[model samples]
Target: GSSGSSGVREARSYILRCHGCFKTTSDMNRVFCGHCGNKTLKKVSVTINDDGTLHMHFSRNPKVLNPRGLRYSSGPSSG
Candidate 1:
């Protein structure tokens, strides 16, 4: 078990917010924002629910992260 895995049938519902335009949509694999021409998107919310009973969630908790050795801390214009 990893990433909080407990060997249970679980489902995840999430919202991805564009780091560029702040646009939000329900998806985990979105690389761009449909509302704006933003190429950077981040997962803003996540809901792990087991049949709607046992669950965990977060709100605006995580931004995005580069690899430990890579520091792309420069603003969007730096790209």
Candidate 2:
């Protein structure tokens, strides 16, 4: 997910692969790899706030570090 603002966003059903177990799981409301019990492959949603702050919400309670928190700028631009 890209960095942006903070706000409520809609995240449709999506598929994600678990890093620990390499199992393909569907993300609905919870994001957890039942195969390996690893939270590394949890699903997350990003929303942009009005103040130019980005907030990320994970689908499930993530025990491991969230990869979605990492930000990568697409290009230089005026904020």
Candidate 3:
């Protein structure tokens, strides 16, 4: 029982915008743009909340530290 005709699991949690190509992708693990092969995949952020819901800014203008993955956290809250 699948939701798609192709029977593929597709659930994205982030959008990475490439400054070189300006092509946004839902692939949060992408370090470089697959279309243009650029090294400017900016706006890479991630945060896990309730079922990965309460997701806001994983960090302010966070940079891609590594191609493996990014360090995410639920920083100090005001509440």
Candidate 4:
């Protein structure tokens, strides 16, 4: 069984980095890191199902994005 919303399905792509492996997805077309030029980057695809729910698909062994690692800390000294 499936929903009948024909135009409800949508797809969105993004580039994210993995701290554990230091790999990143810069270009969706290419499954490799744009900065380090590593060929270990995985392709992540996200789709909006007809029920308005998001479905994520990853290529190979992909790691989840760590928000803490992506955050930048500020110094105590002020300018």
Candidate 5:
């Protein structure tokens, strides 16, 4: 005798996320990752709950995360 999933509140905001490094940035106008220095940035929709909880909505497209620039060498290749 109860209703659920129909009374969700919303405090909308946007965050830039690096799909390659899996890091998030608060800037909405920036391109490229500040940490990984890659061009795998994507905008994510987030909701701030009344109790200080963050809910992030991901892209439905499966090709969001690209591994174009994520290949790193473990050590020095040649001097």
Candidate 6:
């Protein structure tokens, strides 16, 4: 006898972080931040294990972040 198909279960979670106020929200499918009411929300992937461990995956792409921060001068502005 051959099994037709096996049942599989998978789950995913998402959160939005306000770029302005740096507030985080777990309510998915939201466009604006509930705390700062800002439209600039950064979507991030997260995982919560059964043991209550939290893990967050941040993007390494330079395009996602402001380049000015990295372009800051090595020494203070002596002007």
- TM-score for each model: 0.42, 0.32, 0.36, 0.29, 0.53, 0.53
Backbone collision count in every prediction? Answer: 0, 4, 0, 0, 0, 0
Q: Which ten residues in a row have the lowest lDDT in candidate 6?
A: 64-73
In terms of TM-score, which candidate is stronger, 1 or 6?
6
Query: Which stretches in model 4 have alpha-carbon errors above 4 Å?
Result: 1-9, 16-25, 45-79
- What overall lDDT goes with each candidate model? 0.66, 0.61, 0.67, 0.58, 0.78, 0.76
RMSD of each: 18.2, 19.2, 17.4, 14.0, 14.9, 12.5
Stretches off by above 4 angstroms in model 5 are: 1-12, 58-79
Model 1, total clashes: 0
Tell me the spans in candidate 3 whose CA falls farther than 4 Å from its real position: 1-13, 44-79
Model 1 lDDT tens row, 6-69:
6777555667777667677767887877988788887664555466642234356667887666
Model 5: colliding residue pairs: none
Worst lDDT 10-window in candidate 2:
39-48
Better of 2 and 4 by lDDT: 2
Error of 3 at 61 (Å): 19
Alpha-carbon RMSD, candidate 5:
14.9
lDDT agreement of model 4 with the native: 0.58
The sequence of per-residue lDDT tens digits that candidate 3 reaches over residues 10-77 is 55456787766767777767787877889878765456676655344534775666557568768776
Off by over 4 Å in 1: 1-8, 47-79
Candidate 4, residues 1-79, lDDT tens digits: the string is 7757555664565555544475555466665555666655555555555787645554578668855546566767776
